[PDB]
Amino acid sequence: MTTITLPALPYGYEDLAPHISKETLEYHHDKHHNTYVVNLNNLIAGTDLEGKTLEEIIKASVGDASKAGIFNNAAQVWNHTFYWNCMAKNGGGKATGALAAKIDEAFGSYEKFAEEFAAAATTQFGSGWAWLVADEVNGKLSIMKTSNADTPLAHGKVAVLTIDVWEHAYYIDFRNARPKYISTFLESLVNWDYANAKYAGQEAGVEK
Amino acid sequence: MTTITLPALPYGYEDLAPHISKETLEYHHDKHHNTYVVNLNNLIAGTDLEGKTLEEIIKASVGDASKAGIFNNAAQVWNHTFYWNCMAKNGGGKATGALAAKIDEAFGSYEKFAEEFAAAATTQFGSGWAWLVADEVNGKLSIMKTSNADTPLAHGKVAVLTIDVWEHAYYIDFRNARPKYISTFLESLVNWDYANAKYAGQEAGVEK
Ligand SMILES: Cc1cc2nc3c(=O)[nH]c(=O)nc-3n(C[C@H](O)[C@H](O)[C@H](O)COP(=O)(O)O)c2cc1C
Ligand SMILES: Cc1cc2nc3c(=O)[nH]c(=O)nc-3n(C[C@H](O)[C@H](O)[C@H](O)COP(=O)(O)O)c2cc1C
Ligand SMILES: [Fe+3]
Ligand SMILES: [Fe+3]
């Protein structure tokens, strides 16, 4: 049977510097993301979910209180892998690819999209995520926020871009200054090539 | 009219060392707790809640979606003040005062209480709090966990002890090792004198 794996970061541990440090990537990927993988494999071992894909596990556990631990760990594995691929060395700034025109259509301009995405990331209370999503591949774009592990697949939406706003994502480099982390993400980290692939339902990134 | 204030810590910024550092107390109290105070005062200014006590504001906003920002900030002001007073230099260990016998009655022993309190603190997913509570002053003890800003007053319960398990409470000193923070809290930080006062409905601590 297949097993859930911790994918490698799609870049080196100094490649997001000085925006996100080596130390953050070490704790965030090598400890937090790893723990979600380990916990999920332990929870599904010897059950009817062993050997299913990560997305099958999320779909099988969403909305089921008796499977909250499975959902929380599986959705967090998926969200972190999505997040790492949403960043890149020399990323950030205005959109490239097909998403540029689609962002202008949905939001009016890149700057309006960035304002709305930053507001979602800023106002998510507690732990969670902010997302650019589509209703379907190549479809209508919108912004949503989620709490804790919740994720666009659990709402039938297609994730396109995400930022993790759990405190561990930014506390080492920014302490309480979540807005500065969010601005840094938009200005200097966003990977539009991955976002475009996800919007177009294409394969991309390091996801296993 | 009265205003909501940031109470001083009830000890010096090195007084919890090495268990909780000066740096954590600076960010956690001087930045996070302060921000909840500032936000709450801004939200109630010029409204019918200005000049009410902190507990009146929580009671007026609980369960009202249109007042979620007021509730989240007011409950977090209260929770942090409660939390600081739940710690002390040379604290920790088995209970003193009336609570010792009440803990034996409710949980069987101090060690069983500590196990259950640590489990609540460990399994709270995302941001939140773990609590020893009573159903009324001098009443029946139990443990509960809350998510984000939620707090025993919003459930008609009397808070007796709390630990903050938002990541900012421990990330500077423990990084991802929340269990080590929880053990450190029980072994070395708990202030039973404050907990006893709260259980007995008496006045105590630095709360303004
Ligand atoms: C955005 C995204 C993130 C994923 N993250 C992981 C992951 O962290 N661990 C894992 O085992 N599978 C993860 N997967 C699933 C695998 O990439 C892969 O789709 C699955 O193992 C099925 O294999 P196949 O695509 O070669 O048929 C992820 C998939 C997607 C779309
Ligand atoms: C546990 C606890 C925490 C509190 N924290 C604060 C606080 O951080 N800021 C504040 O303005 N009032 C806080 N209060 C309310 C004040 O301590 C006080 O009760 C209120 O201002 C009413 O004043 P009085 O007790 O002198 O009549 C807190 C009260 C309690 C019980
Ligand atoms: Fe994270
Ligand atoms: Fe806190």
Author numbering:
A (entry chain A), B (entry chain A): 1 to 208
What does the study report here?
Acinetobacter sp. Ver3 is a polyextremophilic strain characterized by a high tolerance to radiation and pro-oxidants. The Ver3 genome comprises the sodB and sodC genes encoding an iron (AV3SodB) and a copper/zinc superoxide dismutase (AV3SodC), respectively; however, the specific role(s) of these genes has remained elusive. SODs are widely distributed diverse metalloenzymes that are classified according to the metal cofactor present in the active site. Manganese SODs (MnSODs or SodA enzymes) and iron SODs (FeSODs or SodB enzymes) are found in the bacterial cytosol and have very similar active sites, suggesting that these enzymes are closely related and evolved from a common ancestor, a relation that is supported by the identification of SOD variants termed cambialistic that use either iron or manganese (cambialistic Fe/MnSODs) depending on metal availability.
In order to explore the structural properties of AV3SodB, we solved the crystal structure of the enzyme to 1.34 Å resolution. AV3SodB crystallized in space group C2221, with one protein molecule per asymmetric unit. The final atomic model comprises AV3SodB residues 1–208. The Root-mean-square deviation (RMSD) between the AV3SodB monomer and the chain A in the E. coli FeSOD structure is 0.9 Å for 191 aligned residues. The active site of AV3SodB, located close to the dimer interface, is composed of conserved residues among FeSODs. mFo-DFc electron density maps clearly revealed the presence of a metal ion bound at the active site, which, based on our bioinformatic analysis, was modelled as an iron ion. The metal ion is coordinated in a distorted trigonal bipyramidal geometry with the side chain of His28 and a solvent molecule as axial ligands and the side chains of His80, Asp164 and His168 as equatorial ligands. The OH-/H2O ligand hydrogen bonds Asp164 and the active site Gln76. This OH-/H2O, believed to be OH- in oxidized FeSODs and H2O in the reduced enzymes, is connected to bulk water via a conserved hydrogen bonding network that begins with Gln76 and continues with residues Tyr36 and His32. Additional conserved hydrogen bonds link the active site to the interface between AV3SodB monomers, including a hydrogen bond between His32 of one monomer and Tyr171 of the other, and a hydrogen bond between His168 of one monomer and Glu167 of the other. Interestingly, AV3SodB crystallized in the presence of flavin mononucleotide (FMN), added as an additive in homemade crystallization conditions.
